Design a protein around this ligand. Sequence first.
Ligand SMILES: *[C@@H]1O[C@H](CO)[C@@H](O)[C@H](O)[C@H]1NC(C)=O
Lengths: 48, 48
Amino acid sequence: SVGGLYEIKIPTNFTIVGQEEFIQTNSPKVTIDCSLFVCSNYAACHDL
Amino acid sequence: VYDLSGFTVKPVATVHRRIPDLPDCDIDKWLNNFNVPSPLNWERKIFS
Ligand SMILES: *[C@@H]1O[C@H](CO)[C@@H](O)[C@H](O)[C@H]1NC(C)=O
């Protein structure tokens, strides 16, 4: 402080800036048929 | 809402392909040949 005063940079001009922010709120609803995935069309597999 | 078990469309026809007019392999004529080798000199024949 020079005496009671401090040096500060105060803005003399300004603009407005935009900023994007994506926030995920959802996801692809994956569904699996466990029987069709594990065994496909094969009866001998569906039995086991 | 119930996701039922997966179906597959039934095949409406059968496609069967084989090369026609191929000769017989004669495997019995070679196996029944009376000049039988020993295990030391075991013989091979290739059928195609
Ligand atoms: C503020 O900044 C803009 C862009 O540089 C300029 O057009 C405008 O004249 C400036 N105004 C002042 C008061 O400096």
